[PDB]
Structures are given as C-alpha cells and as structure tokens.
Amino acid sequence: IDPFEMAVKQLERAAQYMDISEEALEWLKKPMRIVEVSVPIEMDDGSVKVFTGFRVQHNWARGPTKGGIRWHPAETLSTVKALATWMTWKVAVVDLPYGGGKGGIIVNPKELSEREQERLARAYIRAVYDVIGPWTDIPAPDVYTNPKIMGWMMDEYETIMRRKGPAFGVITGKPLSIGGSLGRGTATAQGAIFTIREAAKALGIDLKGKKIAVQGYGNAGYYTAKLAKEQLGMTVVAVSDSRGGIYNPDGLDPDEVLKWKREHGSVKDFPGATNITNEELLELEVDVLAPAAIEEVITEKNADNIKAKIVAEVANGPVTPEADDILREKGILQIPDFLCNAGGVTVSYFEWVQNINGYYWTEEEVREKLDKKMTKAFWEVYNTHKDKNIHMRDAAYVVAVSRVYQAMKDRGWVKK
C-alpha cells in the first residue's frame, strides 16, 4: 500500500547511506507488533456500533514504544504502520529511550457526541490494554484527538490496571490536573525554534533582527512565530494559512495576527499589511522559512525559487525529496521534518518521565531539558551531514536508523 511502501522506500534510501545488515533492514521493514481489534460502543440511541482499531508497535529495541492515536475515518492499517515507522525515527533522532508506536481507529469523530467519544476512548483501551502500558506502549495525542480523550483513556487504563502501577504514565498529553506536563501545547514550535537557532549557529550567522516567514498558521505556526520573535530577536515578516497570506516587511506581531484571525474568521486582511498568496510566500526571500501547513508545499516546480538559508520543516513532510535535493545543491540548510517537529515527542517523553517518577517539573525545567535534547539531536544530525557529505534529512535518517540498529544488536535481536 502507498503509505507503508513509501516509508519502506524512505528507510531503504536511508540504509544505502549507512552500514546496515540485510537482516536488520528486513527486520525493520516488518513492524514487530500489529494489533487489529474490534472496538464496540453503545450509541446514544441504544444501538451498538463496532469500529476497527489498530495499534502498531513498529519496534521497542530502544525502549517502550511511543505513538499517537488518530481518530480519522480514512484510517488504514498501512497508514498506521507507516506512521509507527515514522515515530520510530522520530524518537530515535532525539535520543529517546522509546520505540515507535501508532494507534488509530477507523471513525469520524465529527458526529460522535461527548458521551460517544468517551465510550470510544474507554472501549479502545479495553480492547488494546494487553498490548499497551507505561513500560511497553505509550499512546499520545494526534489528529482529531484532544487531551480530554486522553484523560478518559488514562482513567480507563487505571480502572483496568487496578491502580497497581504508574497509570498516568500509560499515555501522554494528559491534562495538567491529571499527570499532565507544562509546554505540551507549544512543544513542537519550541523544538522547531531550538532547531532554528541551532541551524543558525551551524551556519555561523546570528539571528539578531532577521526575517522569518511561516506558511501555514495553525497553533504550531503561530507559536513558532511568537517564540522566534520572543527568543531569537528575529522579525516575522509574513504569516499565512491555507486560505490567505499577510505581507509586512516592516515587522509583525503573531499575537495581533491570531487575534485578527479569531475576530474576522480568517488570517487575511491584517491591518497595516498586504494580502498575499501562499505560493509566492513559499518563494519569498527571507532568512528562515517554515512550512507549517498541508504536506508537500515545496515542490520541484518551485524548489530553486527558495532563497532562505534555513528551511525549518515544522510540518511533517512539507518538502518532496526532489525539492530537498534541489535545496541541498543550492547551499540551503534544511531541518528535516521529523527532527524539526520532535519537540512534541520530546515534551511527551518528559511528561512520561514526570508521570513515572511521581514528580512534576516546572515550565522552565521542561524548557531547559527540551532545549538541551534538541540541541544535542540537531548537532548529531549536522555532524553526520558534514562527515558523510549527505543531505541533512539523509543524515537524520542515518543517525536514527543507526541508533535503532545498535539497540537491536545490543539486545541480540540481529547477530550481524
């Protein structure tokens, strides 16, 4: 199927640039555990509806598997497996003691009521309990899943486990009142900012008063722009959603931008600025560029038109491999997508650590630890990029797969 085959092809393109045994490659191609279950719930009308849930633990060589849960009507087993393989490298690049996990249910939660959503969450936990756990498999928020659902599922897991172990730790993204952690909402953007100034440091150019352009202005993009302005001293020059765009070389403020979006219902028509299109924004000449929108916005059709020195792929796969190569041959440093967005995963790991130990950190402690881990991961990726003379995304794949393969070899799973 298209997604899993794409993930396997990406793993092969990673493996051709690093010393990996054939048995290890075949072992990585087949996910360790796949659990397809029927999740029954009782609707408000009294009828019983059964959905199909998937729980794919791609690997646990480096530690307990970690992965999000997607409630999407278009969910497929291949998509879940591919995203589990994704999360494996996501946790591997940033040195987490995690394996790759991925949960999902074939369900459209638009018409599901709050009672139905709670029942679906609890029933999914009742179905997949035997293949999850704090030390085995940690679910995390993903598309169409909010931390309220995770409060529900943590409650269900605690009820089944009879409070015997660290229940909070079974899942992450939980509300602050119950085993939650600070910085979860801004996790991905904060990690992206860490990678951005690390890229600037690697390039040898500071960020005092330079330009950043973000394309796609969801929560992640808005937080990225705001944190960049607050910390790096950079000047945001353009913000856009999939609908419209804003141009202001003099400088913007993400707070008033989001307020205008909330008032008017769209981000466009910002006062003191020009309405612009997303396409020319993608080719805008800036210092830092961050695509935070629907996947594959930078294409071979316009890859050479990007002039920003640093491209931070905040979104997952916003650049096609050919555009990645074109930017590489243009001297453009690209932060790979799964390394750039690993802030959410790192903060989720921090939440898991806080839940396991029963001690909860403060926001400053979480931010400092996230900064340290992101800096180390980025420097490992950059050093591999320099030494092996391969693409930055290629370097991140190489380091992640090397860590996973080392974990397997030390575990004795693969002899060679």
Ligand X SMILES: NC(=O)c1ccc[n+]([C@@H]2O[C@H](COP(=O)([O-])OP(=O)(O)OC[C@H]3O[C@@H](n4cnc5c(N)ncnc54)[C@H](OP(=O)(O)O)[C@@H]3O)[C@@H](O)[C@H]2O)c1
Under the binding rule (CB under 6 A), the answer on residue 43 touching ligand X is: no
Going from the C-alpha of 392 to that of each of 141, 274, 322, the distances in angstroms are 28, 34, 14
**Mask for 242-261, x = binds ligand X (CB under 6 A):** x-------------------
Strands 33-42 and 310-312 come out as unpaired
Give the active site residue among 90, 102, 174, 309.
Answer: 102
Q: Which one, 187 or 207, has the nearer CB to ligand X?
A: 187
Output the CA torsion sign for 132, 138, 144, 145: positive
Q: Is 102 a catalytic residue?
A: yes
Choose, by CB under 6 A, the member of 80, 153, 212, 293 that binds ligand X.
293
Choose, by CB under 6 A, the member of 134, 216, 245, 291 that binds ligand X.
216
141's enclosing H/E stretch is strand 137-141
Q: Which one, 14 or 191, has the nearer CB to ligand X?
A: 191
**Angle (CA) 278 284 287, round 5°:** 125
Under the binding rule (CB under 6 A), the answer on residue 147 touching ligand X is: yes
DSSP SS3 for 84: helix
Distance CA 101, CA 265 (A): 36
Output the CA torsion sign for 335, 341, 347, 348: negative
* Residues 154 to 213 in contact with ligand X, rule: CB under 6 A: 173, 184-185
Choose, by CB under 6 A, the member of 262, 294, 300, 329 that binds ligand X.
294
Q: Which one, 90 or 184, has the nearer CB to ligand X?
A: 184
Choose, by CB under 6 A, the member of 1, 43, 50, 143 that binds ligand X.
143
Q: Using CA atoms of 42, 48, 49, 55 in order, give the dihedral in degrees to the nearest 10.
A: 60
Going from the C-alpha of 236 to that of each of 208, 227, 300, 335, 380, the distances in angstroms are 12, 10, 26, 19, 28
Point out which span in 73-81, 140-148, 224-232, 389-397 binds ligand X (CB under 6 A).
140-148
Q: Which one, 133 or 147, has the nearer CB to ligand X?
A: 147
Catalytic residues: 102
Interface positions with ligand X (CB under 6 A): 141-143, 145, 147, 173, 184-185, 216-219, 241-242, 293-294
- Please give the annotated binding residues for NAD(+), written as ranges: 216-222
